[PDB]
Amino acid sequence: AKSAANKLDWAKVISSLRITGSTATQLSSFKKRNDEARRQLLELQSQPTEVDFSHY
Amino acid sequence: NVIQDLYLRELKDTKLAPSTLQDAEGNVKPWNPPQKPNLPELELQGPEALKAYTEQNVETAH
Amino acid sequence: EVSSILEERIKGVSDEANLNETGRVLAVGDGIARVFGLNNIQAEELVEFSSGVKGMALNLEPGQVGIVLFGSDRLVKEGELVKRTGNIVDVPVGPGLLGRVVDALGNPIDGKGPIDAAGRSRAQVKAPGILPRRSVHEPVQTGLKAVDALVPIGRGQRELIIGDRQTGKTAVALDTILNQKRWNNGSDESKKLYCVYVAVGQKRSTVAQLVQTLEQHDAMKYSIIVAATASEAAPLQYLAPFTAASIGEWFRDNGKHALIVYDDLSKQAVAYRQLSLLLRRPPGREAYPGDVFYLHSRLLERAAKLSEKEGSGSLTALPVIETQGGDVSAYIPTNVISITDGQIFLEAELFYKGIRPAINVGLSVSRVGSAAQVKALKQVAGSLKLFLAQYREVAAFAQSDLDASTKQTLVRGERLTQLLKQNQYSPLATEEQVPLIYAGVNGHLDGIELSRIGEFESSFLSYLKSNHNELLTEIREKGELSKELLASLKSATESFVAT
Amino acid sequence: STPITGKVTAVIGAIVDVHFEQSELPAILNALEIKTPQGKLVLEVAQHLGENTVRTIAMDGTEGLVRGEKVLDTGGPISVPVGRETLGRIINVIGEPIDERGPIKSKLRKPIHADPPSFAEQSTSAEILETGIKVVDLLAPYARGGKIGLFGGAGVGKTVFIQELINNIAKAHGGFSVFTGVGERTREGNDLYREMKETGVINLEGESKVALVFGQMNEPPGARARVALTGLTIAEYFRDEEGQDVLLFIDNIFRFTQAGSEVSALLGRIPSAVGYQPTLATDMGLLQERITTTKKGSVTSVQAVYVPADDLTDPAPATTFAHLDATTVLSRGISELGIYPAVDPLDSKSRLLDAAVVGQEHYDVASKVQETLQTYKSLQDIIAILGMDELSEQDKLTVERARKIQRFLSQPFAVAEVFTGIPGKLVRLKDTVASFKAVLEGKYDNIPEHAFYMVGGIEDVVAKAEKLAA
Amino acid sequence: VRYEASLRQLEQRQLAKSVISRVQSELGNPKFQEKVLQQSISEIEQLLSK
């Protein structure tokens, strides 16, 4: 998933060597990583819909 | 003595009934019901994307 | 409930202004009520206003006595009756103040209720005489290696702590207190130093940090914090060290020992300045009252090691003076420097250079010093002063093509400096100070790599603790390093050094 | 009208003595209003001189005063209105709107003087603000509920620094803010009004997430002294009554000291050291002590300070230096070197910097940075006379890292889109620790010095390396 | 929760202004005459005890 994404990214660095003009390997990799890390921390900052109704 | 007179009258005759829920409500955060997880929609439509991706890749070595 | 508060007011009944003298304010401006009345009035007597404000009577002028308010102006207004408390300023003194944070009046600001104090004794009381003092012979151990060896501190002794503003000046002080917990736990009241921190002009938030840290380190149970906070009025701030000293006198008088840290007398000075200026009494040199020398000296001479006929007790003291950007020349520093016997001068460069806490031991001096020092610690620390002295000189020869002798000195010195770094809020015991210094003295740390000095230190301590806790126990109990003990210790040091 | 009618006796500037009659004598710190064709002159009662003749300080102008003029007593310290609707109002010293959104809607009124809260009330701070500004985050992290102190001289655009803070911290933060300007320029006032109308912090449609109290330097000195106290009470209403956390902001507090010095002189209190008021300490103390993190609310003051001729040993800055939690010194020199932020990193320390508290790793990294920079500053002297030839390879590597670090700190800000054009780099604290760590490890010591200059984080530094490369 | 705690504190201040109202009643009543006479005779007694 996320580990697949990054493994394929590093594979793509040496793929980007194969063809000069690469500038959208970087756009794909950067874009997927950026929003991936953001959604991952979004999921880590997830507070399920819960409230006190016992303590408070 | 004078304190006693004041006290007797004060304690006995003066009692506050707790404030309305509205007054408390005003002095605290109100609460409102939010909506939606988020509604996004499908990405690029048609063969505009399809043609664009095949063609745009000209990032081939020169 | 509502009842308890009302019942409290009912308890607060009693009235009659039957007092030989009352006063009536003539005019009140600037917190200097000028009162017509109070014909009989002791000098600096506590007076209670109609508004319950308390005051002292610094100026007894022939027709009017210019009371200085300890309270807020707003309540006071002209004409108002000024009841005469009839008691010169006195504060409760007694054993109750152990683990109690009290304000200047004595009122617990930690709200631990009425003090279990057995007397009220005056704010200013004349200092012990010639014969009421015996020469110092008991050291106190701060748990700071450099201080204990380089700047040895006795008991009933006052050495200055003059240094740069908020460089954890308060931190340097606090470290000493932490080592006093260990000794405090121990028996003999001489070993039980009941520390007093006198927080002068310090905001309540800062003191809250102190209080919690002290509670964290369990220090509250011998600690006393006499607090005159930033908010607290300039009379309270002025009288705060004097008041504090009296608390110390009770412990001292009972023959016990204690350590009082006046922090910082510089803000006390400012408060006296405020008082003087408001009383229109001319301000001395550098606009700080002229007889500030007399006040500070009186305070600082009430800290002493009493004689054995006076019950073998003391009040060790450590005043703190805040330098005005490292200015040790200035009327208040010069005066205090003269009064104090010893100085500790923290160096800002050293702080930046990672000696945190930072001390510059060139500009630290002890004028009583090694007269009270652990005998063991004397043995293993003459060399250290000299080595470091050489290290200072060859410091500036450390900028290319270097002679072997200088380079050797430089190596020994650099390792020592790293060793003498102190980790704030961690004190040390003498039985663990001496091995570390011994190693350095024997130059066994000359070989140890600089990065590994830090690692070495703790490792050596653990190695000693497991292997040679006989040695540690011997060091602790003997208090002197026997040749056999130094032999074994050297062996142990070599063995650990080898690994 | 009021039986408590007083007749002016002496107009000696701000000192105006009033002659209240018999059996009537306002208490100290009261507020008198005098009907005038200049509205109500407000007089703060500051002394009683006896014989029912008080000596009061004027707040408003003193021109066109005629002796023997009837003086009504409003009593107690000037009481402004406070309320939920105070947000989105610019309020002058006497508590009256100066943004012509009509009269402020009073829920409550309170006096502008308020007693400092006791030891018991204080709650011990530990929360860490993260401004997203590298120098602040790494080398002197800020704390919520703090008393941040922006020591600097003039010229360092003190207001500009605060504007960046409002953009970052305020917008991010949910709580309200109070922007208080003590004796500041009407150029600055107009700019601030416009700028926060634009940034929508002041959103005229609906409410604002801030209230403003603009006290300006043309206002008479008495008003300059007592603007600060006023602003604080508005914050107290939020803090206490509305139970909010407030980002207080005050500007420039030297004006507060200076103002007090003037009226000390006028009060006849002979000027104390370096011409500063003898009550400097207690006035400072009253301001700082009032501000605290109560159980009802945490207030984070950011106070600008003007350090005359960059001498912070001058008693007015030096006295403040003790009283504030999280000092920063923005040195002119560093600004001139082109490093924006202009913070001098070896002269900027905060109480919250304690090793494990700010993260043991964070501390160690920052300690390494500091040592590296301190070495660099010392070695500049060696380079100056001796040359760079007497620096060892190790020393040279430390210098190269320091030069890179020095300009790694340089980063643009949103408020120097105006000054320059570059949009600010909000670089998170965690990211900064990592990014600075990388440099020290030497992972980006293969990146040119100027590709560290005036840019963001490590990723950006790599990108700018590519930019210089091609 | 915050206002819930607050209301308990606030109530005492609400009850405080009611004491003031009761003060206005006391000083209006011939408690103003009779209890002032009580203060007078009590003061006579205090001063006699000197």
PDB file of C-alpha atoms in Angstrom, chain C residues 26-30 73-77 109 204 230-231 270 273-274 286-287 324 352 399-400, chain D residues 26-29 46-51 119-120 270 273 278 281-282 285-286 313 370-371 390:
ATOM      1  CA  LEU C  26      -4.486  64.206  57.041  1.00  0.00           C
ATOM      2  CA  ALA C  27      -3.705  63.444  53.462  1.00  0.00           C
ATOM      3  CA  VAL C  28      -2.900  60.251  51.720  1.00  0.00           C
ATOM      4  CA  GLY C  29      -1.018  60.366  48.511  1.00  0.00           C
ATOM      5  CA  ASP C  30       1.588  58.027  47.094  1.00  0.00           C
ATOM      6  CA  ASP C  73      -4.215  52.988  47.923  1.00  0.00           C
ATOM      7  CA  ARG C  74      -7.790  52.658  46.722  1.00  0.00           C
ATOM      8  CA  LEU C  75      -9.236  51.575  50.050  1.00  0.00           C
ATOM      9  CA  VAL C  76      -7.527  54.366  51.974  1.00  0.00           C
ATOM     10  CA  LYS C  77      -8.921  57.907  51.869  1.00  0.00           C
ATOM     11  CA  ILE C 109       0.078  31.313  50.055  1.00  0.00           C
ATOM     12  CA  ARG C 204       3.767  34.048  41.356  1.00  0.00           C
ATOM     13  CA  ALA C 230       6.406  40.832  42.260  1.00  0.00           C
ATOM     14  CA  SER C 231       2.891  41.964  43.150  1.00  0.00           C
ATOM     15  CA  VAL C 270      15.059  48.652  44.297  1.00  0.00           C
ATOM     16  CA  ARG C 273      14.909  52.855  46.659  1.00  0.00           C
ATOM     17  CA  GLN C 274      11.185  53.069  46.069  1.00  0.00           C
ATOM     18  CA  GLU C 286      23.580  55.421  41.753  1.00  0.00           C
ATOM     19  CA  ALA C 287      20.181  56.437  43.113  1.00  0.00           C
ATOM     20  CA  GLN C 324      23.405  44.606  35.448  1.00  0.00           C
ATOM     21  CA  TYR C 352      26.770  29.406  25.646  1.00  0.00           C
ATOM     22  CA  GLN C 399      44.125  28.656  18.531  1.00  0.00           C
ATOM     23  CA  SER C 400      48.237  25.529  15.489  1.00  0.00           C
TER      24      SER C 400
ATOM     25  CA  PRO D  26     -13.491  60.446  46.239  1.00  0.00           C
ATOM     26  CA  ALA D  27     -11.295  57.477  47.089  1.00  0.00           C
ATOM     27  CA  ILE D  28      -7.891  56.999  45.450  1.00  0.00           C
ATOM     28  CA  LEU D  29      -8.054  55.681  41.890  1.00  0.00           C
ATOM     29  CA  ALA D  46      -4.091  59.715  42.392  1.00  0.00           C
ATOM     30  CA  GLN D  47      -3.597  61.631  45.609  1.00  0.00           C
ATOM     31  CA  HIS D  48      -5.553  63.438  48.184  1.00  0.00           C
ATOM     32  CA  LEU D  49      -3.734  66.554  49.259  1.00  0.00           C
ATOM     33  CA  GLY D  50      -6.114  67.171  52.138  1.00  0.00           C
ATOM     34  CA  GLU D  51      -8.665  69.898  52.872  1.00  0.00           C
ATOM     35  CA  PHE D 119      -0.705  32.280  44.162  1.00  0.00           C
ATOM     36  CA  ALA D 120      -3.533  29.784  44.512  1.00  0.00           C
ATOM     37  CA  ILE D 270      11.566  63.137  41.796  1.00  0.00           C
ATOM     38  CA  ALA D 273      17.439  56.033  38.161  1.00  0.00           C
ATOM     39  CA  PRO D 278      10.493  55.158  41.270  1.00  0.00           C
ATOM     40  CA  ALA D 281       9.001  48.087  39.338  1.00  0.00           C
ATOM     41  CA  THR D 282       5.558  48.033  40.852  1.00  0.00           C
ATOM     42  CA  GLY D 285       4.727  44.106  38.325  1.00  0.00           C
ATOM     43  CA  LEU D 286       1.073  45.029  38.298  1.00  0.00           C
ATOM     44  CA  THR D 313      21.099  47.271  30.464  1.00  0.00           C
ATOM     45  CA  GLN D 370      24.210  26.722  19.395  1.00  0.00           C
ATOM     46  CA  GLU D 371      27.730  25.487  19.955  1.00  0.00           C
ATOM     47  CA  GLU D 390      44.853  28.895  11.237  1.00  0.00           C
TER      48      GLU D 390
END
